[PDB]
Enzyme design. Sequence first.
Site, PDB file in Angstrom:
ATOM      1  N   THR A   1      -5.197   6.245   8.967  1.00  0.00           N
ATOM      2  CA  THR A   1      -5.915   6.485   7.710  1.00  0.00           C
ATOM      3  C   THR A   1      -5.982   5.272   6.792  1.00  0.00           C
ATOM      4  O   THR A   1      -6.521   5.365   5.675  1.00  0.00           O
ATOM      5  CB  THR A   1      -5.282   7.636   6.939  1.00  0.00           C
ATOM      6  OG1 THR A   1      -4.006   7.214   6.470  1.00  0.00           O
ATOM      7  CG2 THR A   1      -5.168   8.863   7.826  1.00  0.00           C
ATOM      8  N   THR A   2      -5.436   4.146   7.254  1.00  0.00           N
ATOM      9  CA  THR A   2      -5.629   2.834   6.605  1.00  0.00           C
ATOM     10  C   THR A   2      -6.270   1.874   7.582  1.00  0.00           C
ATOM     11  O   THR A   2      -6.138   2.039   8.794  1.00  0.00           O
ATOM     12  CB  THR A   2      -4.314   2.192   6.130  1.00  0.00           C
ATOM     13  OG1 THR A   2      -3.435   2.052   7.245  1.00  0.00           O
ATOM     14  CG2 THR A   2      -3.645   3.040   5.078  1.00  0.00           C
TER      15      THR A   2
ATOM     16  N   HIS B   1       1.913   9.094   1.324  1.00  0.00           N
ATOM     17  CA  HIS B   1       0.786   8.897   0.429  1.00  0.00           C
ATOM     18  C   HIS B   1       0.957   9.857  -0.714  1.00  0.00           C
ATOM     19  O   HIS B   1       1.377  10.997  -0.493  1.00  0.00           O
ATOM     20  CB  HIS B   1      -0.537   9.169   1.138  1.00  0.00           C
ATOM     21  CG  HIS B   1      -0.686   8.406   2.423  1.00  0.00           C
ATOM     22  ND1 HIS B   1      -1.447   7.264   2.526  1.00  0.00           N
ATOM     23  CD2 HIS B   1      -0.154   8.620   3.652  1.00  0.00           C
ATOM     24  CE1 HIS B   1      -1.362   6.798   3.767  1.00  0.00           C
ATOM     25  NE2 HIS B   1      -0.578   7.602   4.462  1.00  0.00           N
TER      26      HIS B   1
ATOM     27  N   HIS C   1       0.833  -1.234   0.000  1.00  0.00           N
ATOM     28  CA  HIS C   1       0.000   0.000   0.000  1.00  0.00           C
ATOM     29  C   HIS C   1       0.857   1.270   0.000  1.00  0.00           C
ATOM     30  O   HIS C   1       0.407   2.308  -0.455  1.00  0.00           O
ATOM     31  CB  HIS C   1      -0.899   0.061   1.251  1.00  0.00           C
ATOM     32  CG  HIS C   1      -1.620  -1.210   1.565  1.00  0.00           C
ATOM     33  ND1 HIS C   1      -2.766  -1.595   0.906  1.00  0.00           N
ATOM     34  CD2 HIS C   1      -1.386  -2.165   2.499  1.00  0.00           C
ATOM     35  CE1 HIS C   1      -3.196  -2.738   1.406  1.00  0.00           C
ATOM     36  NE2 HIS C   1      -2.374  -3.107   2.370  1.00  0.00           N
TER      37      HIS C   1
ATOM     38  N   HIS D   1       6.253   6.869   6.267  1.00  0.00           N
ATOM     39  CA  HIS D   1       5.793   6.505   4.937  1.00  0.00           C
ATOM     40  C   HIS D   1       5.132   7.711   4.298  1.00  0.00           C
ATOM     41  O   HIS D   1       4.964   8.751   4.934  1.00  0.00           O
ATOM     42  CB  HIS D   1       4.783   5.346   4.977  1.00  0.00           C
ATOM     43  CG  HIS D   1       3.546   5.680   5.738  1.00  0.00           C
ATOM     44  ND1 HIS D   1       3.436   5.494   7.097  1.00  0.00           N
ATOM     45  CD2 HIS D   1       2.384   6.255   5.342  1.00  0.00           C
ATOM     46  CE1 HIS D   1       2.260   5.930   7.505  1.00  0.00           C
ATOM     47  NE2 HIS D   1       1.594   6.390   6.456  1.00  0.00           N
TER      48      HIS D   1
ATOM     49  N   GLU E   1      -3.566  13.406   2.065  1.00  0.00           N
ATOM     50  CA  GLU E   1      -4.721  12.885   2.768  1.00  0.00           C
ATOM     51  C   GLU E   1      -5.444  14.030   3.457  1.00  0.00           C
ATOM     52  O   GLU E   1      -6.622  14.291   3.209  1.00  0.00           O
ATOM     53  CB  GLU E   1      -4.257  11.815   3.747  1.00  0.00           C
ATOM     54  CG  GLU E   1      -3.586  10.633   3.044  1.00  0.00           C
ATOM     55  CD  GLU E   1      -3.790   9.329   3.773  1.00  0.00           C
ATOM     56  OE1 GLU E   1      -3.311   9.222   4.920  1.00  0.00           O
ATOM     57  OE2 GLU E   1      -4.413   8.412   3.205  1.00  0.00           O
TER      58      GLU E   1
ATOM     59  N   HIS F   1       4.065  10.850   6.601  1.00  0.00           N
ATOM     60  CA  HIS F   1       3.611  10.489   7.942  1.00  0.00           C
ATOM     61  C   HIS F   1       4.738   9.866   8.748  1.00  0.00           C
ATOM     62  O   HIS F   1       5.217   8.773   8.418  1.00  0.00           O
ATOM     63  CB  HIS F   1       2.439   9.501   7.851  1.00  0.00           C
ATOM     64  CG  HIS F   1       1.180  10.124   7.336  1.00  0.00           C
ATOM     65  ND1 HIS F   1       0.108   9.394   6.868  1.00  0.00           N
ATOM     66  CD2 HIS F   1       0.842  11.429   7.224  1.00  0.00           C
ATOM     67  CE1 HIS F   1      -0.848  10.233   6.496  1.00  0.00           C
ATOM     68  NE2 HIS F   1      -0.432  11.463   6.716  1.00  0.00           N
TER      69      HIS F   1
END
EC number: 4.2.1.1
Length: 257
Positions: free
Chosen positions: A195-196, A93, A61, A91, A103, A116
């Site tokens: 958020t996952t 996004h 992901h 990590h 996000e 993040h």
Amino acid sequence: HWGYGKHNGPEHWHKDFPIAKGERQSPVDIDTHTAKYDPSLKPLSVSYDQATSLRILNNGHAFNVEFDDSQDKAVLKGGPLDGTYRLIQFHFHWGSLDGQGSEHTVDKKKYAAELHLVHWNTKYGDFGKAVQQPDGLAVLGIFLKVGSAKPGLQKVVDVLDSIKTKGKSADFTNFDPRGLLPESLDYWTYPGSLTTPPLLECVTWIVLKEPISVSSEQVLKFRKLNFNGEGEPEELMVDNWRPAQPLKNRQIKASFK
Ligand SMILES: NCCCCOc1ccc(S(N)(=O)=O)cc1
Ligand SMILES: NCCCCOc1ccc(S(N)(=O)=O)cc1
Ligand SMILES: [Zn+2]
């Protein structure tokens, strides 16, 4: 398994993770005019001098850069926080296009990506226990805009070829995450969630006001990663972001006027 595609993306997650529709979900839109300056908020204390990075992993992901969190080596304190939070991984996004990827949004504006830096509250002993607590995690969120290159990001960019597909990892020692921060540590904060999936409501979000700039070549290399494993049909790892969720009964506080 959950993902970011049409058939397994954010619209679907609630079916296996019903907390998706809960009271303190993340990310959110940060309406800068409605956030309130809180003069009682303390300065952030980011103490990364002794950070020990170990490994970088494509987990299907995103990619995580992992740290030794078995001692207080890289910690976050102050700000809205009580106590000491240890850095376990960071990590990103990001989007398929420069106009999307983050996000959190700011006055509905989307950045090209979001970093993040994930920390857990040492009073809970380990990360698995921390995510089961309302004050278990502190995630430092940093927006990425496309412009000039971020020199301290380049060592990350250059290893991505070795972790193209899901489940691949590479040694990633001696990386200094201080190179990923902006100049200012002015921030917004609010209570939220992962958020996952599993979307646990365990995070104090601290989102920096000042974005970092990365080059188009840097984010282009993010977009060459794969969601799939080796020997499977190629699916570019892009648009691995959850959209803004309802703010509900929360107020975003600002450290600055
Ligand atoms: N039409 C078939 C699509 C295949 C995927 O099925 C899924 C269905 C639900 C999920 S969830 N609730 O974890 O996001 C993930 C995958
Ligand atoms: N209980 C196991 C949890 C595994 C997931 O860990 C996460 C850690 C952080 C995040 S985010 N995007 O909110 O910073 C998401 C997931
Ligand atoms: Zn994240």
